[PDB]
Design a protein around this ligand. Structure first.
Ligand SMILES: Nc1ncnc2c1ncn2[C@@H]1O[C@H](COP(=O)(O)OP(=O)(O)O)[C@@H](O)[C@H]1O
Lengths: 103, 79
């Protein structure tokens, strides 16, 4: 989408932009992310899921916004989530824990 | 030249990172030096996300582990 710049100027529909990757535990995942960062067409910053899950109610959600507020302020970025399983809420609706707030 | 002062974590200014950096620069001075860690309170994180909000100390520990051994050089001598 970036290299073929002129054609994509004519795009009337929001560009596909998000990709998710499963994998048997640790089979090269962060290293792949690192390389795809180092191609350097885009900047990179990343969060590791267990880092931000504070017990404090506010920070727990505020730390996600901490990423976007910086990313949007500079340039196109990867904003890689490692360990994304730990943020995901396992489709929980009854407990309404902080995880629901974060998601 | 041991730490001997890890409990002096930080001021109100976030200078702790600079402080620890200076600690390891003093380490790199007199290159054959061994740094003894008292291992008391500046080693706070039990779970990494639950102790004392993961505030100043979490930055301190992150920096400490980041710089602890970067495979710098054998001649560095920092043990
Ligand atoms: N194809 C590969 N080439 C080089 N290193 C690899 C490869 N596959 C896995 N690794 C190693 O495994 C780890 C990949 O990172 P990651 O999968 O995030 O590990 P973890 O999930 O345990 O944090 C790195 O230590 C990397 O050196």
């Amino acid at each position: 989408p970036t290299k073929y710049e002129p054609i994509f100027v004519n795009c009337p529909l929001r560009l596909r932009s998000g990709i998710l990757l499963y994998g048997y535990p640790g089979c090269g995942k962060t290293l792949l992310a690192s390389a795809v960062a180092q191609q350097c067409g885009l900047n990179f910053i990343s969060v590791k899921g267990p880092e931000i899950l504070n017990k404090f109610i506010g920070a727990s959600e505020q730390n996600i916004r901490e990423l976007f507020e910086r990313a949007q302020s500079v340039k196109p970025c990867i904003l890689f989530f490692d360990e994304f399983d730990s943020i995901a809420p396992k489709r929980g609706h009854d407990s309404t824990g902080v995880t629901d707030r974060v998601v | 030249f041991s730490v001997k002062g890890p409990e002096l974590l930080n001021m109100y200014i976030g200078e702790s990172e600079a402080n620890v950096r200076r600690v390891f620069q003093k380490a790199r001075e007199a290159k054959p030096c061994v740094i003894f860690f008292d291992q008391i309170d500046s080693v706070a994180p039990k779970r990494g996300n639950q102790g004392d909000s993961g505030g100043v100390m979490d930055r301190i520990v992150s920096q400490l582990l980041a710089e602890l051994d970067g495979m710098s050089t054998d001649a560095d001598g920092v043990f």
